[PDB]
Amino acid sequence: EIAVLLTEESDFSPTPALVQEQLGLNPASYALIDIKSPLDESYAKRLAHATQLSVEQLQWLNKNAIENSSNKNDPAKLEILAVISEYRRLHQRYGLSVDPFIAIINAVNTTHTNENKTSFFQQIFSTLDVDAGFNFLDQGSWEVIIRKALGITAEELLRIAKYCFGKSSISNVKMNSKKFSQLYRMAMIPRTLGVSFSQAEYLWQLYSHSDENIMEKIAQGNALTIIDAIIVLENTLQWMSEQKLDITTLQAMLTKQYSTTATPELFNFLSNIYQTLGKQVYSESLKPNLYRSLANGFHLKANVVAGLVNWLAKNDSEFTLERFWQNISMTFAEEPSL
Amino acid sequence: YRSLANGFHLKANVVAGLVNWLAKNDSEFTLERFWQNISMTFAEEPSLHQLEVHQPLLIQCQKLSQYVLIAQWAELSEQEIALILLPNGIDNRGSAPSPSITLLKLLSEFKLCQQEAKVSQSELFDIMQQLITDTNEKQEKLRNS
Amino acid sequence: EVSNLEKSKIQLEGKKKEEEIKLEQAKDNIQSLINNWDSEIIIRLADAYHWDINIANSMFILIFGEKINFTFHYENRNDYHYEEHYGYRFEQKPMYSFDKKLTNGFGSILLLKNHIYIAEKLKIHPGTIIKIKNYIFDDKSNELE
Amino acid sequence: QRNLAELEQGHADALYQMQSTRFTGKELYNWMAGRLSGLYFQLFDATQP
Amino acid sequence: PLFATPVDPKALQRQHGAGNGINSGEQMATAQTSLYRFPLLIERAKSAVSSVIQFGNSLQSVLERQDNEAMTLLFQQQQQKVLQHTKDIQNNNIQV
Amino acid sequence: LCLMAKAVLEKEVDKAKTDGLFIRSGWNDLYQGLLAGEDLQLNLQKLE
C-alpha cells in the first residue's frame, strides 16, 4: 500500500521487497532460498512455513510456476517468489487454494494422490479425457460439463475459445492438461472476483489502446502477465465501486458504436439551431450565437459548450463546428422532415 | 385538433391520432361530418334541446370520450398511436384495430416492451417500424428525400 | 461604386465556397445508401434489449424458418455452420433477408422475448428450446435423451 | 404499513410521470430558452444601430 | 432445513413525455398590394405585433396554470387515499 | 401586415437587401405557437 501510492508508473512490477512482506521472509532469508525445479527438503520447508501450505503442494507450485515463466532453465528467482507471494495475497483475500491457483497459471492437477479419492481435474471436470479431441468449433458432449465447471454461457464459451487458440485452429484441438488451463484461466478470474464474464472482458478491453489485443496476452501469457491482469481488475473494480459507477453508465460514456437513428428529439433540437439562427455564411460572429443556442438547447452554460466543442475539435478531427453548421444548413431546407 | 386537444387536457398530436383512429372503426364517423354536425346546431339561438334532438353528436362525443379513456389508461404517446396507425400495424388485423380485449392487452404487452428495453424508446419505435415496414418503400423514400 | 460591389463579389464567393462543400457532402452521403439487408434490425433488437447477436438471430431463424424464407448471403457457405443441437453459430456478422410482411410485426418480438427469456433462465442452447417445442406440440418423444 | 409504503411509492411515480409528460415541462423551457435567448441578441443587434 | 430469500427486486424504469414528435413547417402566404406607404403600415403592424406578444404571454400564463391545477388535483386525490389507509392502520392499532 | 410592409418596402428599397426577413413562418404547431410574435417583432425591427 505504501508502494502503490508512491509509484509514478502504472501497476507495479514485482519488486523483491514486496515479496518479503506478504510471503513472510527476511532479506537474509531471501539471499539463500535459490531455486531449482525440485528445491530441497530444506527450502521447501521454509517456503511451506512462510506460506500456510505443506511441502508437496509447494513442490507442485514450484514445478508449475517455472514452466510458465520467462525461461524453462530456471532463471529469475524473483519471478517464482512473486508468483508465490501473489498466491499468498489471493489466498488471504479469497479462498483460492493451491490447485485453482495452479490451474489458473499452469496445468490442472490430474494426478490422483493420497487425497480422498481423486484429483482436482476430475473434481472440477467430472468426466473428460486429457489429450482428447474437442470440436468446440461446433459442439460436443463435453460442452455440458465445461459449462458445469466454469459457469459459462454458450457464446461466451465460443468467444473464450476464439482467444487462447486463435481464429484458425478452433476445430481440431487435442487439449492436454495445459489447454484446459487456457479455459479455466479466462473464466475463473471473474468468478473469484465479483465480476461476470462479459463485464470482465469489457473492463479488460477498455483499459487498452486502439491497436493491440490484451485478451490474447491475458489468455496466452506468462505468470506475471496473468497476475497483472488480476491486479488491473482489482484496481478497476475498486475504483468503480468507490464512486458507484455502474458498467451501464460507463458503457453510455465510453462507447464508439453510434447507431444511425434519426430520433425526433434531435429533429426538434436542431430545428431551433437553424430556425432561430437563419441561413448564414459562418462568420465568426455566428460562433458565440451557435454556442449560446446549443448551450440553451440543453440545460448547460455557454462557456462549458464552448469548451466542449473545442474539446471535440481535436479528438475525432473530422468534427468541426463549421462542418457542423454546414451539415445543419444542408438539411432543414424549405421542406424539412425526418 | 388543437381546440379539441385544449378542450380536454390532451396534446394536439394525440387527438390527431385518435380522430384518425376513429376514422376507420365506425366509418360513419368523419371529422368533416363532426364539424358539419357541430355547425348544424349552435345557430343564432343555441340551447340544450337542440342537442337532445341531434343525437349523432351525442353518439360521436361519447365515442370520442371512450378512446380518450383508452388513451389515458394505456398512457399513449403520439408516436405510440402513430405506430398503430400504420396501414397494417401489428399484422393481426388491418390498420386501427377495434377496442376489444385483444387491443387492450396488446397495449399492455406493448407497455411491458417499453419497460423491458432500458434504452431510449424512440429507438424502439424506429426498430419496430422497420419490422412493420418493408425496406423497399423506405429506401426509395430516402432516395427521394 | 466599383469597390463597394467588389465586397459583394467576395461575399458571393464566400457563400459559393461553402455551398460546394454542401454539394460534396450531399453526393457523398447519398451514394452510400445500399446496405439495407434486413438482418440489422434484429441486431438493433439485441442492441436495445440486452441480448447477444448469436442467440437472438439463431432463435429468429430457427423459429420462423417454417413460415418465411430466410435466403442467406453468398460467399458465406462455411461461415454459417448449422447443426441440430445448437444451430447457426454465426462465425461472422449474420446477413440474411427474410421476406417481411408475412410474420406478425410486433407479436414476433413478444415471441422472441419469451424464447430468449427461457434460454437465459434455464440456460439451455437456443437450438434445443425448439426441440422442447417439438416434444410438447408435436410429441416426438425421441428427443428426451 | 408495507402496503401503505408501496402505495406512496406508486404516488411518487405518478407525480414524476405527470411532471415528465407535462406540456410546460423541461422540454418546453429548453425550447423557449434556446429560441428566445437567440432572438434577443438579434433584436439587440437590430436595435443598437 | 434450508432457507429461502428473494434476490434483487427489480426497480422500475424511466418514462418521458414523448408526445413531441416531428414539426410540420407551415408555409407563408403572399400579400398582394396596399396603396398606403411604409410609415403608416409600420405604425399599424407594430401595434398588431404588440397585441400578438401580449396574447402569447396570456396563453403561456393560462397554459401553465392548467398544468399546475392538474398536478394539484392529482395530489389531492392521492392524499385522500393515503389518509384512508392510515385510518386502517389506526383500526388495527386498537385491536392490539 | 408584415408581408404588406415587406412588399411595400421592396418598391423603394431594392430586393438585394430585404432577402432574409420573412422566409420562415414563426408559428410552431408542435408547441402552442409560443414566441411567434417575437419573430414578427424582430423581422419588423430589421425591416425598419
Positive/negative CA dihedral, E62, E66, E67, E73: positive
Q: Which of B118, B122, B145 has the CB atom closest to A263's CB atom?
A: B122
The amino acid at residue F22 is: F
Positive/negative CA dihedral, C126, B129, A267, A299: negative
**Residue indicated by cell numbers 512462510:** A50
Cell numbers linked to F40: 414578427
Q: Touching check for A274 and chain C: CB below 8 Å?
A: no
Q: Which of A248, A264, A337 has the CB atom closest to B122's CB atom?
A: A264
- Collapsing DSSP to helix, strand or coil, E56 comes out as helix
Q: Which residues of A touch C52 (CB under 8 A)?
A: 155
Phi, psi of A173 (to 5 degrees): -120, 125
For the stretch C44-63, what's the b/e string if a residue is b when 16 or more beta carbons lie within 10 angstroms of its beta carbon? bbbbbbebbbbbbbbbbbbb
Residue C125 C-alpha, separation from nearest chain A C-alpha, in angstroms:
7
Q: Are the Cβ atoms of A292 and D38 closer than 8 angstroms?
A: yes
Phi, psi of A314 (to 5 degrees): -105, -55
Q: Are the Cβ atoms of C48 and B124 closer than 8 angstroms?
A: yes
Count of CB atoms within 10 A of residue A276's CB? 25
**Residue A1 buriedness (CB in 10 A; 0-12 / 13-18 / 19+):** exposed
Residue F11 makes CB contacts below 8 A (sequence gap 6+) with: none
Q: Touching check for A209 and chain D: CB below 8 Å?
A: no
Which residue does chain A place closest to F25, by CA atoms? A275
Q: Are the Cβ atoms of D32 and F46 closer than 8 angstroms?
A: no
Q: Are the Cβ atoms of F30 and A268 closer than 8 angstroms?
A: yes
DSSP E11: P
Phi-psi map region of B91: left, alpha, beta (phi>0 left; psi -120 to 50 alpha) = left
Strands A132-134 and A173-175: antiparallel
Q: Which residues of F touch D23 (CB under 8 A)?
A: 32
Count of CB atoms within 10 A of residue A45's CB? 14
Cell numbers linked to A168: 484458425
Residue C109 makes CB contacts below 8 A (sequence gap 6+) with: B113, B128, B131, C45
Q: Are the Cβ atoms of A281 and C81 closer than 8 angstroms?
A: no
Q: How far is CA C125 from CA C54, C78, C83, C116, in A?
A: 11, 21, 12, 10
Q: Which of A248, A261, A337 has the CB atom closest to B126's CB atom?
A: A261
Rounded to an integer, what is the distance from CA A246 to the centroid of its chain?
16
Q: How far is CA B121 from CA A263, B137, C45, D28, in A?
A: 10, 23, 12, 19
> For residue F41, which of E27, E57, D31, A273 has the smallest C-alpha distance?
E57
Distance of alpha carbon A262 from alpha carbon A338, whole angstroms: 7
Distance from the first to the final alpha carbon of chain E: 33
Distance of alpha carbon A60 from alpha carbon A110, whole angstroms: 12
- Collapsing DSSP to helix, strand or coil, B119 comes out as coil
Which residue does chain B place closest to C98, by CA atoms? B134
The amino acid at residue A301 is: K
Residue B115 C-alpha, separation from nearest chain D C-alpha, in angstroms:
14
Q: Are the Cβ atoms of A139 and C55 closer than 8 angstroms?
A: no
**Residue B83 buriedness (CB in 10 A; 0-12 / 13-18 / 19+):** buried
- Collapsing DSSP to helix, strand or coil, B19 comes out as helix
Beta bridge mates, A133: A174
Q: Touching check for A285 and chain E: CB below 8 Å?
A: no
Rounded to an integer, what is the distance from CA A54 to the centroid of its chain?
32
Phi, psi of B69 (to 5 degrees): -65, -35
> For residue A205, which of A159, A174, A136, A148 has the smallest C-alpha distance?
A159
Distance of alpha carbon A149 from alpha carbon A108, whole angstroms: 13
Which residue does chain A place closest to E26, by CA atoms? A335
DSSP E12: P
F43 close to E69: Cβ distance less than 8 angstroms: no
The alpha-carbon radius of gyration of chain C (Å, integer) is 26
Q: Touching check for E42 and chain F: CB below 8 Å?
A: yes
Cell numbers linked to E17: 413525455
Distance of alpha carbon F45 from alpha carbon E50, whole angstroms: 12
**Residue E80 buriedness (CB in 10 A; 0-12 / 13-18 / 19+):** exposed
Residue F36 C-alpha, separation from nearest chain D C-alpha, in angstroms:
10
Q: Touching check for E1 and chain D: CB below 8 Å?
A: no
Subunits in contact with chain E (3 or more CB pairs closer than 8 Å): A, B, D, F
B78 close to E19: Cβ distance less than 8 angstroms: yes
> For residue A69, which of A98, A39, A35, A41 has the smallest C-alpha distance?
A35
Q: Which of C11, C18, C86 has the CB atom closest to A154's CB atom?
A: C86
Distance of alpha carbon E72 from alpha carbon E65, whole angstroms: 10
- Collapsing DSSP to helix, strand or coil, B73 comes out as helix
Beta bridge mates, A134: A173
Beta bridge mates, C97: C71
Strands C71-72 and A132-134: unpaired
Q: What angle do CA F26, F28, F30 make, to 5 degrees?
A: 170
- Optimal mutation site among F40, F42, F47, interface E, most CBs of chain E within 10 A: F40
Distance from the first to the final alpha carbon of chain C: 97
Q: How far is CA A67 from CA A62, A148, E56, in A?
A: 9, 28, 82
Q: Touching check for A247 and chain C: CB below 8 Å?
A: no
Distance of alpha carbon B66 from alpha carbon A274, whole angstroms: 41
Give the 3-state secondary structure percentages of chain F, helix then strand then coil, rounded to 5: 50, 0, 50
**Residue A226 buriedness (CB in 10 A; 0-12 / 13-18 / 19+):** buried
E17 close to D25: Cβ distance less than 8 angstroms: yes
Helix (H) or strand (E) run with residue F47 in it: helix F36-47
**Residue B69 buriedness (CB in 10 A; 0-12 / 13-18 / 19+):** exposed
A63 close to A55: Cβ distance less than 8 angstroms: no
**Residue A326 buriedness (CB in 10 A; 0-12 / 13-18 / 19+):** middle
Cell numbers linked to A73: 532453465
Distance of alpha carbon F7 from alpha carbon E30, whole angstroms: 9
Phi, psi of A133 (to 5 degrees): -80, 140
Distance of alpha carbon F44 from alpha carbon F48, whole angstroms: 6
Distance of alpha carbon B89 from alpha carbon B93, whole angstroms: 8
Distance of alpha carbon C104 from alpha carbon C87, whole angstroms: 23
| Total CB pairs under 8 A between chain D and F | 24
Distance of alpha carbon B124 from alpha carbon B118, whole angstroms: 10
- Chain D 1-20, residues with CB within 8 Å of chain A CB atoms: none
Distance of alpha carbon A133 from alpha carbon A140, whole angstroms: 10
Count of CB atoms within 10 A of residue A189's CB? 19
- Collapsing DSSP to helix, strand or coil, B50 comes out as helix
Q: Touching check for B12 and chain F: CB below 8 Å?
A: yes
- Collapsing DSSP to helix, strand or coil, B100 comes out as coil
Count of residues in chain E: 96
Q: Are the Cβ atoms of A263 and B123 closer than 8 angstroms?
A: yes
Distance of alpha carbon C7 from alpha carbon A281, whole angstroms: 14
Residue A247 makes CB contacts below 8 A (sequence gap 6+) with: A199, A202, A203, A240
Q: How far is CA C67 from CA A141, B43, B128, C104, D8, in A?
A: 31, 59, 20, 11, 48
A29 close to A46: Cβ distance less than 8 angstroms: yes
Cell numbers linked to A138: 461446433
| Total CB pairs under 8 A between chain A and E | 17
**Helix F36-47 with E38-95: angle, nearest 10 deg:** 160
Phi, psi of C58 (to 5 degrees): -70, -35
For the stretch C82-91, what's the b/e string if a residue is b when 16 or more beta carbons lie within 10 angstroms of its beta carbon? eeeebbbbbb
Q: Touching check for B111 and chain D: CB below 8 Å?
A: no
**Residue B135 buriedness (CB in 10 A; 0-12 / 13-18 / 19+):** middle
**Residue E24 buriedness (CB in 10 A; 0-12 / 13-18 / 19+):** exposed
Helix (H) or strand (E) run with residue E86 in it: helix E38-95
Distance of alpha carbon B68 from alpha carbon B59, whole angstroms: 14
Distance of alpha carbon A131 from alpha carbon B103, whole angstroms: 60
Q: Are the Cβ atoms of E19 and B77 closer than 8 angstroms?
A: yes
DSSP E85: H
Residue A334 C-alpha, separation from nearest chain F C-alpha, in angstroms:
8
The amino acid at residue A107 is: A
> For residue A295, which of A276, A320, A281, A314 has the smallest C-alpha distance?
A276
**Residue indicated by cell numbers 458465406:** C76
Distance of alpha carbon C81 from alpha carbon C90, whole angstroms: 7
The amino acid at residue C16 is: K
Q: Are the Cβ atoms of E75 and D24 closer than 8 angstroms?
A: no
A80 close to A62: Cβ distance less than 8 angstroms: yes
The amino acid at residue C55 is: I
**Residue indicated by cell numbers 345557430:** B43
DSSP letters spanning chain C: --HHHHHHHHHHHHHHHHHHHHHHHHHHHHTT-----SSHHHHHHHHHTT--HHHHHHHHHHHHTTTS--EE-SS-TTTS---SSS----SS---EE---SSS-TTHHHHHHHHHHHHHHHTT--HHHHHHHHHHHHT---S---
A233 close to A189: Cβ distance less than 8 angstroms: yes
Distance of alpha carbon B101 from alpha carbon B84, whole angstroms: 16
- Collapsing DSSP to helix, strand or coil, D11 comes out as helix
Q: Touching check for A155 and chain C: CB below 8 Å?
A: yes
Distance of alpha carbon A153 from alpha carbon C55, whole angstroms: 11
**Helix F2-12 with F36-47: angle, nearest 10 deg:** 20
Q: Which residues of A touch F20 (CB under 8 A)?
A: 278-279
3-state secondary structure chain A: CCCCCCCCCCCCCCCCCCHHHHCCCCCCCCCCCCCCCCCCCCHHHHHHHHCCCCHHHHHHHHHHHCCCCCCCCCCCHHHHHHHHHHHHHHHHHCCCCHHHHHHHHCCCCCCCCCCCCCCHHHHHCCCCCCCEEECCCCCCCHHHHHHHHHCCCHHHHHHHHHCCCCCCCCCCEEECCCHHHHHHHHHHHHHHCCCCHHHHHHHHHHCCCCCCCHHHHHHCCCHHHHHHHHHHHHHHHHHHHHCCCCHHHHHHHHCCCCCCCCCHHHHHHHHHHHHCCCCCCCCCCHHHHHHHHHHHHCCCCHHHHHHHHHHHCCCCCCCCHHHHHHHHHHCCCCCCCC
> For residue A332, which of F23, D16, D5 has the smallest C-alpha distance?
F23
Q: How far is CA B98 from CA B42, B59, B91, in A?
A: 32, 17, 13
**Residue indicated by cell numbers 444548413:** A329
Distance of alpha carbon C88 from alpha carbon C94, whole angstroms: 9
Q: Which of F35, F45, F46 has the CB atom closest to D35's CB atom?
A: F35
